Amino acid sequence: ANSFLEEMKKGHLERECMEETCSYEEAREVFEDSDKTNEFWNKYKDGDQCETSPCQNQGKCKDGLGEYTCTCLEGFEGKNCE
């Protein structure tokens, strides 16, 4: 993950953030983008969480570090649009 050269060479996602802990930034360095910085790094150890689409009734998903947000449309709500 870290070394004298692991973080001195070119930043590639096919290198640093994959086979250790991927603590931080090494998922942001590759892209230079703090938008999905903490909406994807939660999916390094335990697997994805929105791939099941818990929200039904045409509701979008949002991943948080422990709980899932389900955006349901006007007049629709719920923990999973439930």
């Binding site: 060479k9 070119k10 590639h12 096919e14």
Partner: protein
Amino acid sequence: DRTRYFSMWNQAVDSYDPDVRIIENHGTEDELPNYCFPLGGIGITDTF
């Protein structure tokens, strides 16, 4: 002369370096830098 040696009488007079007694200072000549390189040559790289 005493500036030469001879084994016969353990004959050699001790001395000292000239520049040690009084040093000199001219810096040096270093306009061209000096570089080390990776054993291969290009080190870093990137799939293509």
